[PDB]
Design a protein around this ligand. Structure first.
Ligand SMILES: Cc1ncc(C[n+]2csc(CCOP(=O)(O)OP(=O)(O)O)c2C)c(N)n1
Ligand SMILES: Cc1ncc(C[n+]2csc(CCOP(=O)(O)OP(=O)(O)O)c2C)c(N)n1
Ligand SMILES: O=P(O)(O)OC[C@H]1O[C@H](O)[C@H](O)[C@@H]1O
Ligand SMILES: O=P(O)(O)OC[C@H]1O[C@H](O)[C@H](O)[C@@H]1O
Ligand SMILES: [Ca+2]
Ligand SMILES: [Ca+2]
Lengths: 675, 675
């Protein structure tokens, strides 16, 4: 049949791609080709419009199997060709060894790090439910799409998927349909060696619906029926158990050897002949298969055409919502939304930057409907919920509604991070955030790094940033955390000092389209600074206190800017003139012009950095660094600052030593380099 | 009764400690006091010998509840007093806001970051089973101890606990007995808002035994009986569901408000009067309670006395095993064990450092019985199993035995990290390791940081360290990873260049008693270096190529040392004389004398670093840094190195630019500083 020919075509494209690269993973593509064929036949999508907002989404959580995904995209006429398949895993190609959303048309997210994709799918489904609740009206199903996810045993072993699956079941996300590749093989061999849990029983315990397909090597009728069944269960996410043979068809099927290396050439020959293909030919695409797939594309394009007319009619019937929806689909924030950002003067009271963050959110959430977010069980500590908003919950619970804007993530930082990536991936201009203590953003590093690589504008509201949190002690106090994330490409790490800087940090975070943000915020109160503004802080780094005859410039962030200002006064009594630079985001600063940066960190003057955590990175901006390179302590915060000499006098002492160290020396800006 | 008085004493000590600090968590201590009383009465321990190897272990995974733990330790006469309780959460005290094994007598591990403790308990239990299988003989139950863990809803939400619980069930760890504080409250309020899964059904799906105690506020008879029942189930870990009221007894019991802030003074008064205590008195310890607890200590000390005689008799009956056991309990490695480390010459073949690591393990595992370890489903890629060894599995499976030495962790990096901490915490000189790709050590950051804070000598075998891995691409290629861990206090991050350096890295890792190790190892082959040795590499940094008239010194690690040596030859043709420094571990180097360090990185010469990942930290050792501060690429590894100009010519160009940049300048060692 044509369906059988399509499945063979998919299998052999994937195998041939791996063969050409002499690298990659043929096993899961061989095992999952029937399911991929069946799922894509049920999906609504336009290969010529990858951003249609009512498309079904597909996520390959077992991203090593990407030769399968690329084969589907090629067969369906996405902007990816057989010539691209021939360049699988080759430098600069459109077919990298794991799928990257920035590079691969039809890759919704970046997968390969196990466990992430299923969580991303939870986030796509969460966003779809919130979006539909916000916009759908009687006779106007603006959003009614599904989220289909493939995942393997490795994803099921990774704790992040447990977190997201518990939460998805709680949230009754009925438009999520996941498929477990139940092939009983991982890299170390049989799953009997390490993974003997009853997966199905676990998923039932989360409140998921289950469908089992006992012969997923051949039974596409049952896979299609499983999808139909899942669609009828509107209040539970569904897990479809696909019992497959890894490497189905290979001489080496059902073995770990078929997981992650190219097949032998003789094996590929016998695959081709058993399935009616020419063993002398590679990258065959039978015209029957193209025709069948094209029929499905044409039908999907007519569905999108009708959706476009539905949307036009929606804009007439619901003028205000229609304009809002249009704006969001155009990727534009509300005009002058930023006029809602709070502004402060030096006469205003001292405030913790966690509380300043609460106040920002309180003002901007009503102004910008595409902002949603939550906390990982730290809502009253991170201060991440705007008073008067409703939680995102299924209405059946009585605890919220899908139109809600505040997500109770529970104690699930890693899944929160990956779910945020999924919400961003949904599109529609979602600007979403997640709160935890800065030290526990580290629990989510797997996902955070992918926010950066995937270029998603997600935001971490990361409070309790330092030893300033006090008594909870060294298990809670960041040391390495900012260095880690600043050393990751494409992460803005804002550490605002005061009210105006906190508003600049949010302006950046919400306006972002390609760069994730971490906002490092304080437990303790900080004064409003003389010289701060949204305008200046928006440059990432700026001259707070200009001193034309400076003996030294002190560069600082966050809670240490006020400390630097106080140290300036101590230094004046010692006959030393200091300037102060505030550096609320190193990435934003780095992106400014060379001349702007040199106006902040000029030649001819020693520069001392002050920040109460690792000194790593700080030599980019300073000659000497005063930081904290040991773990913290459990005590009242001011006593910890005193212990480590982060006091006006301690900073002044190190500033005076720095001035003395450079006496008789020629000093150029830390911004200078040899190459 | 005396038991009722003990429970009230525990509750009120905990409440009074929080009150004195005006900080901390009274709710879970109030709810768990009955269970703590019951468990400690069943436990065998010696307050005067915290390291007795056959003690039962207790772990407080919900570490915020530590006022409870400290109260138990005080009541039982550990080296912790009521005066220490009065200094709860105060700078420098023995009663920090979360328990720290380095500081608190009777704290087996450091908890507070949720999810970690239960995983640590899995590791303690894994070690106990391996230890017992290794040493026990007929009539010689050298090891027969239990591992008791308290955990809350937060630990159950964290994915790391799912990973460890799946694995513990697979491993049939019958001496693990965990207790869930089922109080239906977390920081964000009712667990109904975020955590509605059927926990018990999930634990059954992992192969755990369950006991439910419906009134754990009062029913210590049922809690004791649950322990007895758990002890009869020898092939399953047990979860005991303790249905409690958070803050039991408080006016605010059963609310989130009682979780994490001090009680009101009037609330504490009514607690005291309801329980027969003086509301005017704080830190009361009724002498009846002390007497009852002392009886249990005296009985436990007689048990340890008899164990000591058993051990003496064991050494007579089993002379070889007895001497081995003695040596391990003395904390000493075998005499001259390091003579088994492989040594190489520059005439030997090029080898990947992952393969050199395999070879080291193959030689030292037979020599050093206290080495055990595993991989997170990457055994044939990390090369972490010595041929001929048996896996750690329950014999019932036929897949291994508890005497085995190789652990199949599955795709569970975070739990692997926390389990390693538990194995180290068991003691008996265990030197344990865990393999994954370096980029996915980041999944385990929560645990890795605790290895450092807890001072545990665990080892990560972290292969595929860079763009050198090639085709798997940027989702797999570390950039930020070494900077992150080097910026964490107390982590040795070894990046060996060749065979001799790899042996030095293992010598350090195995000899360690207080410092975790990460060994960053290559996929690709590297040459044996002229000038390397175990002796020199053991210093962390050393002069590989000395050049008395150097125009520049190139400092490098790992795969980039050979690159630097090749660049030296290119520079010679340009009339530039270079020296080369190899810096296999920055922490070990930093610990050398100032004079030694200056012999490696002298004044008066420009120094260029070369390492194919983040430049963060490198200014400690260099004036200019050539690194990789963007994500990688999917392609053949040599082509990626060429793309980013990590070639002999690219290094030479930057070296020549560095020499030119410092012409006419006075250059001092990067090791110099102003303070
Ligand atoms: C977080 C993470 N850890 C480790 C790996 C390395 N890795 C790639 S695939 C795989 C396991 C393969 O098992 P499974 O998901 O069952 O895939 P299948 O063998 O069925 O193809 C591992 C451990 C990874 N990609 N991501
Ligand atoms: C990894 C991590 N994330 C977040 C926190 C902050 N935190 C401390 S206790 C807690 C939750 C309390 O819930 P539970 O464990 O049920 O404790 P109980 O309220 O019953 O005392 C949270 C989120 C933490 N300590 N560790
Ligand atoms: O005063 P906050 O810092 O907001 O919160 C106090 C504690 O309450 C919660 O357990 C938090 O995790 C803290 O440990
Ligand atoms: O050749 P190796 O790098 O050891 O392993 C090749 C692949 O096989 C496994 O999926 C690994 O995770 C890799 O992606
Ligand atoms: Ca599998
Ligand atoms: Ca709880």
């Amino acid at each position: 049949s044509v369906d059988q020919k399509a499945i063979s075509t998919i299998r052999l494209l994937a195998v041939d791609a791996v063969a050409a690269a002499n690298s990659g993973h043929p096993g899961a593509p061989l095992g999952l080709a029937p399911a991929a064929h069946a799922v894509f036949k049920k999906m609504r999508f336009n290969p010529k419009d990858t951003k249609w907002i009512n498309r079904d989404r597909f996520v390959l959580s077992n991203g090593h199997a990407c030769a399968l995904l690329y084969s589907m995209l090629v067969l369906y006429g996405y902007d990816l060709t057989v010539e691209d398949l021939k360049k699988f895993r080759q430098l600069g190609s459109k077919t990298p060894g794991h799928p990257e959303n920035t590079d691969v048309p039809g890759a919704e997210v970046t997968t390969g790090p196990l466990g992430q994709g299923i969580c991303n799918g939870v986030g796509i489904a969460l966003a779809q439910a919130q979006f539909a609740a916000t916009y759908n009206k009687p006779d106007f199903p603006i959003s009614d799409s599904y989220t289909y996810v493939f995942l393997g045993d490795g994803c099921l072993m990774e704790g992040v998927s447990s977190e997201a699956s518990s939460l998805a079941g709680h949230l009754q996300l009925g438009n999520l349909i996941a498929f477990w590749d139940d092939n009983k093989i991982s890299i170390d061999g049989s799953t009997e060696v390490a993974f003997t849990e009853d997966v199905i029983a676990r998923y039932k315990s989360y409140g998921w619906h289950i469908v089992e397909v006992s012969d997923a090597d051949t039974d596409i009728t049952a896979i299609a029926a499983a999808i139909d069944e899942a669609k009828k269960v509107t209040n539970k996410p569904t897990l479809v158990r696909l019992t497959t043979t890894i490497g189905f068809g290979s001489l080496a099927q059902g073995t770990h050897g078929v997981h992650g290396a190219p097949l032998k050439a003789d094996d590929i020959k016998q695959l081709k002949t058993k399935w009616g293909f020419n063993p002398e030919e590679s990258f065959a695409v039978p015209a029957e298969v193209t025709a069948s797939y094209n029929e499905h594309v044409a039908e999907n394009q007519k569905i999108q055409q009708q959706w476009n007319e539905l949307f036009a009619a929606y804009k007439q019937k619901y003028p205000e919502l229609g304009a809002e929806l249009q704006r969001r689909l155009d990727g534009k924030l509300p005009e002058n939304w930023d006029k809602a950002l709070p502004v402060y003067t030096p006469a205003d009271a001292a405030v913790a930057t966690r509380k300043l963050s609460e106040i920002v959110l309180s003002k901007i959430i009503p102004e910008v409907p595409e902002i949603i977010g939550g906390s990982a069980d730290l809502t009253p500590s991170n201060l991440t919920k705007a008073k008067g908003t409703v939680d995102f919950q299924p209405a059946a619970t009585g605890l919220g509604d899908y139109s809600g804007r505040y997500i109770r993530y529970g104690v699930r930082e890693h899944a929160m991070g990956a779910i945020m990536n999924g919400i961003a991936a949904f599109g529609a201009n979602y600007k979403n955030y997640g709160g935890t203590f800065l030290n526990f953003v580290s629990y989510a590093a797997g996902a955070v790094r992918l926010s950066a690589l995937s270029e998603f504008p997600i935001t971490w509201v990361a409070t309790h940033d330092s030893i300033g949190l006090g008594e909870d002690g060294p298990t809670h106090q960041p040391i390495e955390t900012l260095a880690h994330f600043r050393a990751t490409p494409n992460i803005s790490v804002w550490r605002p000092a005061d009210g105006n800087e906190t508003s600049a940090a949010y302006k950046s975070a919400i306006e972002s389209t390609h760069t994730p943000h971490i906002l490092a915020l304080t437990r303790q109160n900080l004064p409003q600074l003389e010289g701060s503004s949204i305008e200046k802080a928006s440059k990432g780094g700026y001259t707070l206190v200009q001193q034309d005859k400076a003996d030294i410039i002190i560069v600082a962030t966050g809670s240490e800017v006020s400390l630097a200002v106080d140290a300036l006064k101590v230094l004046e009594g010692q006959g030393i003139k200091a300037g102060v630079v505030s550096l609320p985001d190193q990435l934003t600063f780095d992106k400014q012009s060379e001349e702007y940066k040199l106006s902040v960190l000029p030649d001819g003057v020693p520069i001392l950095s002050v920040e109460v955590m690792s000194t790593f990175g700080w030599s980019k901006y300073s000659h000497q660094q005063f930081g904290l390179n040991r773990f913290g302590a459990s005590g009242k915060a001011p006593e910890i600052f005193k212990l480590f000499e982060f006091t006006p006098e301690g900073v002044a002492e190190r500033a005076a030593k720095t001035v003395a160290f450079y006496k008789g020396k020629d000093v150029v800006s830390p911004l200078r380099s040899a190459f």
